[PDB]
Design an enzyme around this catalytic site. Structure first.
Site, short mmCIF file in Angstrom:
data_model
loop_
_atom_site.label_atom_id
_atom_site.label_comp_id
_atom_site.label_asym_id
_atom_site.label_seq_id
_atom_site.Cartn_x
_atom_site.Cartn_y
_atom_site.Cartn_z
N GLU A 27 70.78 29.93 11.57
CA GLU A 27 69.84 28.83 11.42
C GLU A 27 69.78 28.32 10.00
O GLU A 27 69.82 27.10 9.78
CB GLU A 27 68.46 29.31 11.89
CG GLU A 27 67.43 28.21 11.97
CD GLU A 27 66.21 28.62 12.76
OE1 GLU A 27 65.95 29.78 13.03
OE2 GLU A 27 65.49 27.64 13.24
N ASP A 50 69.39 32.52 16.45
CA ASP A 50 68.19 31.85 15.97
C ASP A 50 67.33 32.82 15.19
O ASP A 50 67.36 34.02 15.45
CB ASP A 50 67.39 31.31 17.17
CG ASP A 50 66.43 30.13 16.81
OD1 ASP A 50 66.88 29.22 16.07
OD2 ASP A 50 65.35 30.09 17.43
C1 LIG Z 1 61.90 26.03 14.83
C2 LIG Z 1 63.05 25.61 15.22
O1 LIG Z 1 63.57 24.42 14.74
N1 LIG Z 1 63.74 26.38 16.08
C3 LIG Z 1 63.28 27.59 16.77
C4 LIG Z 1 62.97 28.73 15.87
N2 LIG Z 1 63.46 28.79 14.68
O2 LIG Z 1 63.05 29.86 13.95
C5 LIG Z 1 61.94 29.63 13.00
O3 LIG Z 1 61.50 30.56 12.31
N3 LIG Z 1 61.46 28.37 12.96
C6 LIG Z 1 60.42 27.89 12.13
C7 LIG Z 1 60.64 26.69 11.44
C8 LIG Z 1 59.66 26.16 10.59
C9 LIG Z 1 58.46 26.87 10.46
C10 LIG Z 1 58.23 28.07 11.14
C11 LIG Z 1 59.22 28.59 11.99
O4 LIG Z 1 62.16 29.77 16.27
C12 LIG Z 1 61.29 29.67 17.45
C13 LIG Z 1 61.33 31.01 18.13
O5 LIG Z 1 60.72 31.95 17.23
C14 LIG Z 1 61.68 28.54 18.40
O6 LIG Z 1 62.82 28.93 19.24
C15 LIG Z 1 62.05 27.30 17.62
O7 LIG Z 1 62.39 26.18 18.47
C16 LIG Z 1 61.27 25.53 19.08
O8 LIG Z 1 61.17 26.08 20.41
C17 LIG Z 1 60.03 25.58 21.13
C18 LIG Z 1 59.94 26.27 22.46
O9 LIG Z 1 59.69 27.70 22.35
C19 LIG Z 1 60.19 24.06 21.28
O10 LIG Z 1 61.33 23.77 22.15
C20 LIG Z 1 60.37 23.42 19.92
O11 LIG Z 1 60.63 21.99 20.02
C21 LIG Z 1 61.50 24.03 19.14
O12 LIG Z 1 61.60 23.50 17.80
#
Ligand SMILES: CC(=O)N[C@H]1/C(=N/OC(=O)Nc2ccccc2)O[C@H](CO)[C@H](O)[C@@H]1O[C@@H]1O[C@H](CO)[C@H](O)[C@H](O)[C@H]1O
Ligand SMILES: [Ca+2]
Ligand SMILES: [Ca+2]
Ligand SMILES: [Ca+2]
Length: 1107
Positions: free
Chosen positions: A481, A449
């Site tokens: 990702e 991720d």
């Molecule tokens: C965001 C996402 O779909 N997944 C996880 C994640 N992705 O990295 C990013 O940089 N995401 C992002 C996307 C759009 C704008 C800004 C950032 O990173 C996060 C950890 O840094 C997290 O795991 C994201 O998933 C979320 O996790 C939380 C719980 O912590 C919750 O379950 C949310 O529903 C998830 O989307």
């Protein structure tokens, strides 16, 4: 533009040699590893016609001192001494040129840096490293404007569905200047095509400048323009802050050329021929062979200590999908496989989640899943971590230039970004190795991720290749990702495969050239999502569309998951069993979406082939973008129609693991997104056979029907959006061993029967029903006497402490119970009418309407008994029962698992005596509490906090309160201030305040601010007509104390039996004391922690009567 000229070539002082196979000859310079020209079948392609005897080492121009030896008829070797005293370069490299049939291989076979460098150790001057080697300026192959049909075709990275990454450039004189990086590049005449591969991890920038392993350059020689393809710069010895990276980060430079005549029998020579040939010389991402048979991807989520999806339960979902798909392969990403779940415990890859069954149950899941072609993956992070993690340490944390922390994600806790370059230089590899040692073999993929967004610093091509190599070395396939991530090594991109994310600028790789080459090897492409336009308006090859039902982003729609597999994924995957052979574009169309009106050139026909010479032809039914036929295709297999518009009848000749099916197991799938009759011509090996049709459901093959074959054809007039499967002989459904390893048969009520339960009472009062979300549940209702259902608990260990729960939602006032009899002892727990709605987003029975049990709500909560086996475990029983009542009780999920809690008078078993929760041995969740509605249905920001001294505790980075009060665990709430709502509450099934009896409730707590959280007493269902609550606002615990404070309250059970206690988020503002942002989140101003809960039944005497 006027016709261009450049210097002619005087080769009077040049000594050429030739190396050659039986089909390809290369004229090579003895002075420098340059190919002047290639010859194949009496046709030629130039190489680098104009000598350029220079390389760039560490971005410094060097004239190498070269010696030459012709090794054999196909192979030449060059020793190249490199010296630049001013720039501390003193080295030598050996280069081989080798012809292998129609390929030319360029390899740096040995590099010696005479400066002292020790991988893994400090270097006092990084300029002493031999860090980059560039042969830019020496084209590996080219084409001239004097040649007929001269053209260049190249791919760059684009993730915008409106903008192709591909350039198609006629090589003419005059022409526009060209000096540009590419991922893939081809030159061709009307007679020969050539493709170039390199292992260079060069980048020229982000976006379309990234993954630029090749560079194309126009050079004018005499009266002709040449476009040549060069390898971009290669990397070698590198360091971070003076610490030289490990040896495994050094990969010897390599590049290859392949030269071909017509390779797809279209009697034209163009880039497509080159692309076919290129598959023999290219890197192949590790694990790519599996991709074509992973038809059913999805995520199974655990979060916040809840254990929504224990490892062994995921096996039952695999079995549902195996039935419902008739044996299509699967890929389940375990998001929350580690620690307390998703976004807990990052970096400690080997910390497999204990509350979901640990390494033992993970190993069982991996093994038992193999026969279903179900591959498991895990979600990890290499960019940020939390104080709780073993690997949180000051040294690994990323700091800004000003000294401040680069704060990362905040959800359960406040994370800090790590410095990935530091990490690589300080033992990252060993963390993967530790996981591999603990878990063993059989894991398929690692999904990393975040990586690629820069949170941890450099996450570009080179750094990604190093990361992927570490993962691949353990035997694992790489997944990431972003659509732009991991182009070299990834096999799966989440934001390509989940079509909903990101919008039109953030999807898969929008390149016909790249998809032609690699479609079969990865899910990295643009899928069908009409609202994005461009390439996403009905791609002919399809493209993976991922949905979920096991809790990711609250997703629970099982039936829609399956419909989507058949609507998009079956045909996407069918095509991946072939390689693309021809690609034909149509005329440009005009589209308007996403705020612009733009031109797009669509693919109109794509052909594919396999090693058996099957031929698949996919044709768009019209080029008119405003016609319905633009979004329709025909598919033929050896000329026989297998798809036309909304319907397909597609052969499938592979088992769930991709192995060839026996003849009597060959089948066809039918699916039609519309109603209506369709007619199909059978292949010759079906045309004279009997044919049987089955409707596929969660129960497998149903509704067997023999079809009438007339003149070699069948006609199907079936339900829309419903899968069917066809065979030449009658088929049955196998035994699934539901819930194997879980000590009970079918504890999710998936087998369509209750016959394995022993039912006491009126059996007509118990049945399997579907929730409003189509989720199967046991329902007991309408009974005037007790109804019970019993099974043995099987496979238990003697002399062992256990927990068991059932999910229960009781709409009756009648007692609904769970009872365990070990043979030596009986324990029981019950609920009257349920009073707490379920707010756990990643749980399938939360109260969101589409998940509702009945009447648009869900009150599912886990109801526990705690027991200990004796010496003989041959007659341990589990009984679910319901006393008389008109209304319904619903049950789902009966999980039996080892547990060492000591909650009842300092003893494990359910029984009498003082209740204590030190949170040290929680089965799952926040028992005896359940999460409340403060955030609605959410990935709740309350969980079990884990100790890691000093980082989790007062004082570290100014932290005001301890995450953990005593032992290794407490109950933590992160930042849920000023919400005027219930954070969590007891429920009677978990702790009953008996009618008329009085209890002393005591606990220790941390609170970062005064009166932001309150201890509360309520009864019945909480309503935010607001419910009456007894309110006790709590002071902060740090301005006048060095540790958690103790709280004590008297509570008398209401006569209605429905008293509860909990923690409430007040309307008061919190106080961050002049701090802000990440510091304010980290330091715990807005937090609440509880530990050492005790609830003791007392009789009020003496001074207790005063308070
Ligand atoms: C965001 C996402 O779909 N997944 C996880 C994640 N992705 O990295 C990013 O940089 N995401 C992002 C996307 C759009 C704008 C800004 C950032 O990173 C996060 C950890 O840094 C997290 O795991 C994201 O998933 C979320 O996790 C939380 C719980 O912590 C919750 O379950 C949310 O529903 C998830 O989307
Ligand atoms: Ca051709
Ligand atoms: Ca504790
Ligand atoms: Ca935590």
């Amino acid at each position: 533009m006027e016709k261009e000229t450049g210097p002619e070539v005087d080769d009077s002082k040049v000594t050429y040699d030739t190396i050659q196979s039986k089909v390809l000859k290369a004229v090579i310079d003895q002075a420098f590893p340059r190919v002047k020209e290639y010859s194949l079948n009496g046709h030629t392609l130039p190489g680098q016609v104009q000598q350029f005897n220079q390389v760039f080492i560490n971005n410094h121009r060097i004239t190498p001192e070269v010696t030459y030896k012709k090794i054999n008829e196909t192979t030449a070797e060059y020793l190249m001494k490199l010296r630049d005293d001013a720039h501390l370069i003193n080295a030598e490299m050996t280069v081989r040129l080798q012809v292998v049939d129609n390929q030319l291989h360029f390899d740096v076979t040995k590099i010696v840096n005479h400066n002292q460098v020790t991988p893994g150790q400090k270097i006092d001057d990084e300029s002493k490293l031999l860090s980059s080697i560039s042969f830019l300026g020496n084209a590996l192959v080219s084409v001239s404007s004097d040649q007929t049909g001269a053209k260049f075709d190249g791919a760059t990275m684009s993730n915008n569905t409106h903008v192709s990454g591909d350039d198609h450039i006629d090589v003419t004189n005059p022409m526009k200047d060209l000096a540009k990086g590419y991922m893939y590049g081809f030159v061709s005449t009307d007679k020969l095509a050539a493709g170039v591969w390199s292992n260079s991890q060069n980048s020229y920038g982000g976006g379309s400048n990234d993954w630029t392993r090749l560079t194309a350059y126009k050079e004018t020689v005499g009266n002709a323009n040449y476009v040549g393809i060069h390898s971009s710069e290669w990397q070698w010895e590198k360091a971070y802050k003076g610490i030289v990276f490990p040896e495994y980060t050094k990969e010897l430079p390599s590049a290859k050329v392949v030269i071909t005549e017509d390779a797809n029998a279209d009697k034209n020579v163009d880039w497509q021929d080159g692309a076919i040939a290129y598959r023999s010389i290219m890197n192949n991402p590790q694990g790519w062979e599996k991709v074509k048979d992973i038809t059913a991807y999805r995520i199974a989520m655990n979060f916040g200590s809840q254990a929504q999806n224990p490892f062994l339960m995921t096996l039952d979902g695999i079995k549902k999908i195996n039935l419902h798909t008739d044996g299509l392969g699967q890929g389940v990403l375990l998001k929350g496989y580690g620690s307390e779940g998703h976004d807990s415990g990052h970096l400690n890859y080997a910390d497999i989640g204990k509350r979901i069954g640990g390494v033992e149950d993970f190993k069982t899941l991996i093994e038992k899943a193999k026969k279903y072609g179900a591959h498991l993956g895990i979600h990890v992070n290499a960019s940020e971590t939390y104080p709780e993690s073993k690997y949180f340490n000051e040294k690994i944390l990323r700091k800004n230039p000003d000294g401040s922390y680069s704060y990362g994600w905040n959800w359960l806790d406040q994370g800090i970004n790590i410095d990935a370059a530091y990490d690589l230089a300080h033992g990252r590899l060993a963390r993967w190795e530790d996981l591999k040692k603990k878990l063993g073999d059989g894991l398929d993929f690692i999904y990393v991720d975040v990586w690629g967004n820069g949170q941890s610093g450099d996450n570009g091509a080179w750094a990604t290749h190093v990361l992927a190599k570490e993962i691949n070395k353990q035997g694992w396939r790489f997944a990431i990702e972003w659509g732009h991530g991991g182009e070299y090594d990834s096999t799966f991109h989440h934001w390509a495969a989940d079509l909903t994310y990101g919008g039109y600028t953030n999807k898969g790789i929008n390149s016909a050239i790249t998809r032609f080459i690699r479609n079969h090897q990865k899910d990295a492409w643009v899928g069908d999502y009409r609202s994005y336009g461009g390439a996403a308006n009905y791609p002919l090859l399809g493209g993976y569309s991922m949905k979920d039902f096991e809790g990711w982003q609250g997703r629970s729609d099982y039936n829609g998951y399956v419909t989507n597999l058949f609507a998009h994924d079956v045909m996407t995957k069918y095509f991946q069993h072939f390689t693309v052979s021809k690609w034909e574009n149509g005329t440009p169309v005009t589209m308007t979406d996403n705020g612009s009106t733009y031109k797009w050139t669509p693919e109109m026909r794509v052909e594919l082939v396999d090693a058996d010479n099957n031929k698949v032809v996919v044709t768009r039914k019209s080029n008119d973008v405003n016609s319905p036929q633009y979004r329709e295709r025909t598919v033929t297999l050896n000329g026989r129609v297998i798809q036309d518009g909304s319907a397909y009848l597609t052969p499938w000749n592979w088992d769930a693991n991709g192995k060839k099916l026996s003849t009597d197991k060959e089948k066809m799938y039918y699916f039609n997104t519309q109603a209506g009759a369709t007619t199909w011509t059978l292949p010759s090996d079906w045309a004279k056979s009997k044919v049987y049709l089955y409707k596929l459901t969660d129960q497998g093959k149903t509704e067997e029907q023999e079809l009438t074959v007339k003149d070699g054809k069948i006609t199907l007039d079936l339900l829309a959006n419903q899968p069917y499967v066809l065979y030449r002989s009658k088929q049955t459904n196998p035994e699934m061993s539901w819930s194997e390893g879980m000590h009970i048969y079918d504890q999710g009520f998936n087998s369509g029967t209750l016959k394995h339960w022993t039912i006491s009472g009126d059996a007509s009062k118990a049945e399997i029903v579907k929730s409003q979300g189509a989720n199967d549940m046991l329902r007991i209702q309408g009974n005037k006497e007790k109804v019970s259902l019993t099974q043995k608990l099987t496979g238990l260990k003697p002399n062992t402490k256990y927990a068991v729960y059932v999910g229960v939602d009781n709409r009756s006032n009648a007692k609904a119970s769970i009872t365990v009899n070990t043979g030596e002892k009986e324990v029981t727990t019950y609920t009257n009418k349920s009073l707490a709605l379920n707010y756990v987003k990643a749980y399938a029975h939360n109260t969101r309407r589409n998940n509702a049990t009945v009447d648009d709500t869900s009150y599912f909560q886990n109801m526990y008994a705690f027991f200990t086996t004796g010496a003989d475990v041959s007659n341990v029983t589990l009984t679910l029962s319901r006393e008389a009542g008109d209304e319904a009780t619903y049950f789902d999920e009966i999980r039996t698992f080892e547990n060492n809690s000591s909650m009842y008078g300092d003893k494990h078993d359910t029984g009498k005596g003082t209740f204590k929760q030190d949170f040290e041995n929680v089965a799952q969740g926040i028992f005896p509490f359940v999460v409340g509605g403060v955030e609605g249905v959410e990935d709740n920001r309350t969980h079990l906090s884990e100790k890691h001294d000093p980082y989790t505790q007062r004082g570290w980075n100014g932290k005001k309160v301890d995450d953990v009060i005593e032992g290794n665990w407490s109950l933590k709430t992160n930042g849920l201030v000023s919400r005027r709502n219930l954070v969590y509450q007891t429920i009677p099934q978990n702790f009953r305040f008996e009618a008329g009896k009085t209890y002393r409730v005591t606990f220790e707590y941390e609170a970062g601010s005064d009166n932001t959280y309150a201890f509360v007493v309520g009864k019945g269902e909480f309503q935010s007509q607001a419910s009456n609550l007894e309110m006790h606002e709590l002071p902060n615990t740090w301005t006048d104390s060095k540790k958690a404070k103790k709280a004590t309250f008297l509570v008398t059970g209401a006569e209605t039996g429905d008293t509860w206690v909990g923690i409430y988020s007040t309307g008061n503002a919190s106080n961050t004391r002049g701090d802000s942002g990440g510091n304010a989140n980290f330091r715990g101003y807005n937090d609440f922690m509880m530990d050492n809960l005790q609830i003791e039944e007392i009789t009020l005497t003496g001074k207790m009567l005063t308070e």
